[model samples]
Target chain A: LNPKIIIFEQENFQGHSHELNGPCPNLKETGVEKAGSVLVQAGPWVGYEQANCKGEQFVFEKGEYPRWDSWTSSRRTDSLSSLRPIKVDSQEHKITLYENPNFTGKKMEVIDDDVPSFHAHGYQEKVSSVRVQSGTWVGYQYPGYRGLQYLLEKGDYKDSGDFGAPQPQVQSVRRIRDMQW
Target chain B: LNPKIIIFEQENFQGHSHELNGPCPNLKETGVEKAGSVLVQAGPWVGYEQANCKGEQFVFEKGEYPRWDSWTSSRRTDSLSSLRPIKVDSQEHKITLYENPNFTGKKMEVIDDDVPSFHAHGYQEKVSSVRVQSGTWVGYQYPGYRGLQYLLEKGDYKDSGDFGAPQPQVQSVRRIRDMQW
Candidate 1:
């Protein structure tokens, strides 16, 4: 009857922008989901790309609330208006965010009328949001903004939140190589 | 400058005795001197027999001071005196223990002194204990113990320690499907 090795306790995300955001809280209720993209490997810098929230990919059955901005890039994005509406239960969950708004894109010219606050100012940026209850589609970033951040950037914004048809593309190129090659 | 994961916190040797004393003030300031063996694994029964506390071409070097002993009958010859003494940085800093005053072989049973107090007892009991600083006969174990603790009925009592070296053969033999197979 030995199966009891439970380790868990090295989860320090620093200031937090999602180091996989499931540190504790039952490991985020057990489902474990959070990936979109944020690569930044070394230092002197060289990496940035994150744009996949417009209805991330639908699929939310079991009481189904589905509308969090149609999949979630925070819908149309205002640089992510504080985006927040996660609550899945019957086991199916997937939310992932961070196709980029500020993961060290190094942009902080703030004139100050009070609109900034991604944690005061220094902007050690890292934008990541994830929710997965089923499986498949697990790529995510924003933890030091790796390799220049580009998860889906090249512009063409405008998808208000339809979240209707997309579901088969589960392999966004194998999640860009399992969450950013 | 990116090699700092450190998340240690799992220690549970239900067979009691724990001590493995040493100079390991946390690897004595991280100079890191030896940590390649002492990985017991066997919590839910199954073929049981993974002990390997550093032998067969050893390689652990750092402050040196290994120690182990927790037998109840795997055939080191029925012992259970409880010795435990291998601490380079304590608190599951990669496992540590030594308590075997000759644990009488057969289903070996020491873990019950009120069942909680090996440093507050926490990690349940995947039975851990590591710390084999350097080579040349310092400390080790795991060699036969009654059809693996199930095909048992009598003859049981194992767990011996102290490694200034004298004889204790059977350095390495893995195979329980090479452990975790």
Candidate 2:
């Protein structure tokens, strides 16, 4: 589906606004100094903390982000400089987390399910690498889906850094479903 | 299954410790002044910001909560004074959000699904009340499941306050699956 997202210079949809139809390398180029609110007319977009989609990632599915806290659990930074729509190619979700980089060591495979705590399943607490085999998923730094998040599309992440996470500490994960059906 | 959770007075499972096999209305009663870290040997437990399981809620599945940030996104309070196991009665998960108090106004029913944004589905964003017909769920104050959270068990919430939310502003909701299989 074609995605449309509106960025506001102030919180709660107030202040200057800019509409994006596709990937945005930098919010500054669009005359949006900073994004205080966001309206995902259509989405499953991943916003980056820095330009060119670098730095911390925040997954913005179809919904309303009234402020910084609305989109970020990490609270690492209040700035959102880049964004791009995420592709949802499958209805089923599957993922595998490796305890060591290069997809080596103890592996935890999740099929069509959300895991709130990897430890609960008797898996190791640290996830050094990941493999998103099916649908889009978000990995959280802590359990119960709290703290920093890493957006994982259908791809291979050889290490935690490949998914933009500074550490191999993903404790929870959940799928990002497209509500367009 | 019986649930067991251990609380520590220092981060990373250090300092004074205490074990709980059942509900505790006040952690002080156990001679623990505060909880800095946690280890859930068996759970899907719910921790509260205040005594008697009141105030903001933090869901802890079977996992390791090494510090305060591991269990909370709200950052409202650093203290965990109460806790109890959350029952997972059904394999199927279903819930309905109301637009007004007393189960009135617009309704959105979700079955075994996670909604990241109510607006994207053409539903009003303000959720005044809710009904959880099966399984446990968590509602976030903003889209993409960020901000403060409210836990909804299998029951009815006549108003937003009934679910312990300060306002009727839940924008995203997701099921809390039991991984005890």
Candidate 3:
């Protein structure tokens, strides 16, 4: 089934609202300048800070976002100009972080564990690169899963910038497990 | 073993730092008016927005917090005034959120699952009360696990206020697991 999401022009699901079943490269085309609230009828979607699905990302699972802060962690951008559904895999979780770019340097391999702090696990170096062997994960710029977030799907990130992070300083990481219907 | 954590006077783990292994009801007593950064040498600690640990809570696992934003979810309070350790359970994770206070009304029971949005599972009512059957969990004010977070350990929260939430509007919840040595 296709994902259904409602974008509201005001907070708390009020004011002008637009429904989307597919990717919206730009919300302005839907007559909404900014998304004040969101109700995901069926989704594990991703909202972007810039239009045409560019810039910082805000991942939304099946839930309600009453305000801009409800989805954003960095707080650097308040408006979502683009949105698209996120494809999740039902595979075993395994990921490895590299201390340097190009998948080189000291490494930390995680399997099916949500790490609140990498330093706590004895891996304190900056995560300059990454490799998602399987499953979907989210990396945070700070410990305890706070600050800027980067989504890591099943792929390889030669550098932190490849995952849309401004810096190679992700301190926390966790798996993104979606509810099976 | 006792937990060890370092509170820095400035961001990026810089400036005068204080160490603690026990609960600190007031950081001012440690000669630190505000905690700018934190290094968890051995911790699954909890920080508070107000002194005497009487305000919003920020849970920190074994990790690094280079700045205040790295640990705080509700930006309303930027500095931490008190600190304490969190006791984590090794039992299976189970939690039930209630629509009304005192565990009445529409209920949602989750067993070993992290819910990014409660509405996704057909539970859209406000969560006024909660019961943590086992393990540790964190509830967010918005969907996708964003906004104000409340740390729910193995206990019963009679009301939202009992969990330190100003309103009964939690949309996302997840389990907190600490690495076993």
Top candidate on DockQ is 3
lDDT of 3: 0.88
A1-181: candidate 2 lDDT, tens digit per residue:
5899999999999999999989998899888788999988787889999999999999987777888888878887898999999887755578999999999999999998888888878886489988888888999987788888999988999989899898898988988877687
Model 2: residue B37 alpha-carbon error in angstroms: 68
List ranges where model 2 is wrong by over 4 Å.
Answer: A91-181, B1-92, B179-181
TM-score of each: 0.13, 0.49, 0.49
* Highest-scoring model, lDDT: 3
Better candidate by lDDT, 1 or 3 = 3
Using Cα atoms, each model's DockQ against the true complex is: 0.01, 0.34, 0.35
Per-residue lDDT of candidate 1, residues B69-119 (tens digit): 221111232211111121111111011222322331221122111122222
**Over 4 Å off in model 3, which ranges?**
A91-181, B1-91, B179-181
lDDT of each: 0.20, 0.87, 0.88
Error of 2 at B164 (Å): 1.6
Chain A TM-score for each of the predictions:
0.13, 0.50, 0.50
Residue B82 displacement (Å), model 2? 58
